[PDB]
Ligand binder design. Structure first.
Ligand SMILES: CC(=O)N1C=CCN(C(=O)c2ccc3c(c2)OCO3)CC1
Length: 149
């Protein structure tokens, strides 16, 4: 699939992250990100997608080496880590046809896996509104421990 780029924005305490809520197939909460355009550099795609989805421009804050990248079902998603953004920042998407809401979440309260349904002897995972964010949570926590401690 086409690579996606975006950001993990943290506040100044490093204990909250900014998530966005879309519609329909992207009806849950996830980090701001989207698909790279032809010939567009990863940092420019991350900034574009984040500004489209949040109205906040990360361009002056991106650090080249500071990101988490995952390959899920053979599609690569790279989120640049952007700490220290104040919680009173006014975030407003460009297109509310794509973004329902924008909120800060406590990192420690976010799930890092979905729950099974072993209580019901049924296979699979229970729905979770953080499903898009979840794969990045443990790597983020590990990354923050290594970088800040
Ligand atoms: C116009 C536009 O940019 N698109 C349309 C709908 C929104 N998209 C996202 O980039 C997107 C991905 C994952 C998400 C998310 C949003 O919000 C919660 O998790 C896909 C592309």
């Amino acid at each position: 699939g086409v690579p996606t780029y975006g950001a993990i924005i943290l506040d100044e305490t490093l204990e909250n992250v900014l998530l966005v809520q879309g519609y329909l197939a992207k009806s849950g909460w996830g980090f701001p990100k989207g698909k790279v355009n032809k010939e567009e550099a990863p940092h420019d795609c991350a900034a574009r997608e984040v500004f489209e989805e949040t109205g906040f421009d990360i361009k002056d804050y991106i650090c080249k080496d500071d990101y988490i990248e995952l390959r899920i079902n053979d599609q690569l998603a790279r989120l640049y880590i952007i700490p220290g953004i104040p919680k009173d920042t006014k975030f407003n998407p460009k297109t509310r046809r794509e973004i329902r809401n924008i909120e800060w979440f406590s990192i420690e309260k976010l799930p890092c896996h979905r729950n099974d349904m072993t209580p019901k002897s049924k296979l699979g995972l229970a729905p979770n509104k953080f499903f898009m964010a979840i794969p990045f949570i443990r790597p983020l926590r590990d990354w923050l421990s290594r970088r800040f401690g």
